[PDB]
Design a protein around this ligand. Structure first.
Ligand SMILES: C[C@]12CC[C@@H]3c4ccc(O)cc4CC[C@H]3[C@@H]1CC[C@@H]2O
Ligand SMILES: C[C@]12CC[C@@H]3c4ccc(O)cc4CC[C@H]3[C@@H]1CC[C@@H]2O
Lengths: 279, 279
């Protein structure tokens, strides 16, 4: 059909739910280009697709390695309909642990994909949307991209980066009638070694790691959302006459987010979050 | 003397002012390791140093390429006093223009240095400060790291990244008695081609570029601060019994920063800043 969509990172989590959520819309108004990094993972996508009976030729597989400029280029050209009416920037990675234990090569990887990779999609897909004078860009945000979480230093870094990349472009894009919004997600219902962590860290840091790993499992269980609810914000947003900049899947997180805003110097939030995690 | 300091990026701007501001303190309590990327730029540093008569052996030159792990390693070892009582993470780069015109290789460069490079310093210097149970980390922040500025997409991205890297580490570091604060700077009094920009962009984007280049020159002239005032926040902060997370060199920027906090969805700030720059 019509709305030509190109989603990134669809081999699990939200991206996958998303493609199928759209591919199979009752109105049959979306064509979908679910992009996988590693093609030999199209399995799940297709299974779930077959389960909802998405009409044939409404979902398509494309491989796309965001850490590489040519792939982004190639992917762009396979969009036969010749436009990408809605672009959903979703590839993202994560990283847990005491900074000192994280390997350089890992940190590099996390920003290349999360940050740089996002920009590369934007580069290739912005122009024609400026050209045509219309289109929609959707970026998967997170609560970690609005406030720092102990032991997630680099993921948060990488999640704030997109917050800044997307708020700047907002201002400029305004008059072009090209839209960009971020979907502020939280825990969604989606699934290092102590020898190695401990090896590379001071035991007191390690005691706190453990302590934190213990606190998030709790938080997950009670705050975590049904993937089908997270994906529904996406469509709520790609259907607003004039969408906002941020869409928040949950509101649970607004209170800590507010008291972070009242005291810019930070000692309030740093303190509340500190005990909120430890004691 | 005593407080062993290691500043990064001291060949101009704030870092340079900083080293000399400290090297030459009347109390003679700081030893300084001004780090240059490119050593054949030690000139200015030394000139200004000679001008304030910093006592000999209170300032030292070290070369340090933040995009490289060994250099950081080597630099660490030349700190003969065997400790880095205060670490001032200051190397940073910038980037102006419509995203679509920015070359990949440039974007990579901006995050490797600003973000990754910061982390690499932290990696090497965090541990022993955790070990000793004391020390101070100072990071040069910016107003662009708290709100997006049109045409500065990637710099802002890269400046929010450190905001998130530093707020996360804050929480964890709390009990170790190791301190970390960011110096939220703005315009400080420190000094692409239209063929090429225009080549790679739609003329309407270009008209807006120009328009913006025109608005910031104005803003600079009236908001810009004497470098000696910016550097004085640094020492105000490395002397607080228990410092806060953020130190703001100016307050001019708080009003826009506040109305950004009241409406999380963003349409308020995006809008105000939009006209604030264009019309
Ligand atoms: C950021 C997440 C939501 C917020 C979570 C939170 C929220 C509050 C809190 O006190 C602790 C944590 C720990 C784990 C966090 C999560 C890990 C990933 C998820 O997106
Ligand atoms: C972010 C800076 C301070 C805030 C400035 C500003 C602040 C307000 C505004 O309406 C426009 C601009 C444009 C240039 C900006 C500056 C460029 C670098 C400087 O640090």
């Amino acid at each position: 059909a019509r709305t030509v969509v190109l989603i990134t990172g669809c081999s699990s989590g939200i991206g996958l739910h998303l493609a199928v959520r759209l591919a199979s819309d009752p109105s049959q108004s979306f064509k979908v280009y679910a992009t996988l990094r590693d093609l030999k993972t199209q399995g799940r996508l297709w299974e779930a697709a077959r389960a909802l009976a998405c009409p044939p030729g409404s979902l398509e597989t494309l491989q796309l390695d965001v850490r590489d400029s040519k792939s982004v280029a190639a992917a762009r050209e396979r969009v036969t309909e010749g436009r990408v009416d809605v672009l959903v920037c979703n590839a993202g990675l994560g990283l847990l642990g005491p900074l000192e234990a994280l390997g350089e090569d890992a940190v590099a990887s996390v920003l290349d994909v999360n940050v740089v990779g996002t920009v590369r999609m934007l580069q290739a897909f912005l122009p024609d949307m400026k050209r045509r004078g219309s289109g929609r860009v959707l970026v998967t945000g997170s609560v970690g991209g609005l406030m720092g979480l102990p032991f997630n230093d680099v993921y948060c870094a990488s999640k704030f980066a997109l917050e800044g990349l997307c708020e700047s472009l907002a201002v400029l894009l305004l008059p072009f009638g090209v839209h960009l919004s971020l979907i502020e997600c939280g825990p969604v219902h989606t699934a290092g070694s102590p020898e190695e962590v401990l090896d590379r860290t001071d035991i007191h840091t390690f005691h706190r790691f453990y302590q934190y790993l213990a606190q998030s499992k709790q938080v997950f269980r009670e705050a975590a959302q049904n993937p089908e609810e997270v994906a529904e914000v996406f469509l709520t947003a790609l259907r607003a006459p004039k969408p906002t900049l941020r869409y928040f899947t949950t509101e649970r997180f607004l209170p800590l987010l507010r008291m972070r805003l009242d005291d810019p110097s930070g000692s309030n939030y740093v303190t509340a979050m500190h005990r909120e995690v430890f004691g």
